[PDB]
């Protein structure tokens, strides 16, 4: 039996469903992540994504910086709080252009029935994400220097 097969039956769609892409697992983990969830309101997703990057940006600006050889973690603290606020400009300005009239997603599931469209892509959508990326980011940054410093 072939490990690799056409995309959900269709062999004339630009993709190949490998055991990397489609499998018993991976289809369960990626849905567990904040962004891919369909039924939840647009507030709580942005916080769960936004917070996370506040810790991925936090470690960095401590040990490699100019004041690495000394204010080393105060130095690294608000600099992680920054790429947060710029992303918020990037994501608020990303939103400012795109959405003028109604959403646009692959409406159905793998099962193929017409499920309700997500608020991930809408006028009131990316706003609460852009807010989630801020309140998550700014607060989420503070806890990489209440634990490593204070």
């Amino acid at each position: 039996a072939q490990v690799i097969s056409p995309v959900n039956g269709d062999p004339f769609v630009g993709m190949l469903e490998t055991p990397v892409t489609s499998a018993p697992i991976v289809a369960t983990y990626l849905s567990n992540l904040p962004a891919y969830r369909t039924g939840v309101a647009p507030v709580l997703r942005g916080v769960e994504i936004g917070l996370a990057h506040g810790f991925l940006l936090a470690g960095p600006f401590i040990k490699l910086g100019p004041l690495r050889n000394v204010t080393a973690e105060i130095a690294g603290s608000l600099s992680a709080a920054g790429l947060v606020l710029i992303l918020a400009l990037c994501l608020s300005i990303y939103g400012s252009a795109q959405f003028q009239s109604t959403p646009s997603i692959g409406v159905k599931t793998l099962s193929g029935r017409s499920v309700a469209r997500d608020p991930l892509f809408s006028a009131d959508g990316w706003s609460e994400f852009a807010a989630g990326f801020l309140v998550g980011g700014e607060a989420g940054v503070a806890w990489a220097y209440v634990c490593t410093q204070i």
């Binding site: 400009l89 300005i93 400012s96 252009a97 795109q98």
Partner: peptide
């Protein structure tokens, strides 16, 4: 150190920051 502490980082960031922002919105919309 009074003037150039203010005007250098505003011309360095805050002028291009809102320029790249308000010119992006002029392009796409």
């Amino acid at each position: 150190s009074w003037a150039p502490s203010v005007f250098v980082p505003l011309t360095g960031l805050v002028l291009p920051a809102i320029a790249m922002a308000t010119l992006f919105v002029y392009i796409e919309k």
